[PDB]
Design a protein around this nucleic acid. Sequence first.
DNA 1: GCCGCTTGGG
DNA 2: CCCAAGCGGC
Lengths: 87, 87
Amino acid sequence: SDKLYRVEYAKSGRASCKKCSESIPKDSLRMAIMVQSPMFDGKVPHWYHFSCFWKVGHSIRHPDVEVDGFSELRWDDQQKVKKTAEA
Amino acid sequence: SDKLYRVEYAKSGRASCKKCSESIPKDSLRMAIMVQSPMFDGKVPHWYHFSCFWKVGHSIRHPDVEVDGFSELRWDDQQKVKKTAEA
DNA sequence: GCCGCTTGGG
DNA sequence: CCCAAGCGGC
Ligand SMILES: [Zn+2]
Ligand SMILES: [Zn+2]
């Protein structure tokens, strides 16, 4: 995927939020900025809590196309993403 | 539990049959005799392919009460175990 | 318990 | 890609 963002239910509880540095609980809704690695050739996620992600300021117009993983979210959460992005 | 035997769909494909020595395929029906390790507070399974389990002299009168995991098997496999035990 | 395979974080 | 945790086998 060449998308800039990723959203998903946390696969583990081990990722640390880049903003607040607190861990992100398994299964919770988390979002990443996908960035190029300096260790190897490929993208790595910078994970944030859902709310922390928005606090650091993004202009995502069409979440469905711009955020990888969007379509695999529960409808409930897809709507929370769209809603949040628009505001 | 405290039961001597366990039956389940194999959690991996890595276990080797203690009768025939061949690997037990992931998700296949497998059976174990359970033994207490003197090295740690935990039970160790000797796994077997379903068919091989009966060829080594392991024997079962009441699967329902003797074999841990029996009631969680698919109906088909419950009747297979019960039938094979009676035989 | 120990260890290797697999998964996940980076 | 490297490293470490989680899981599975024993
Ligand atoms: Zn955060
Ligand atoms: Zn066998």
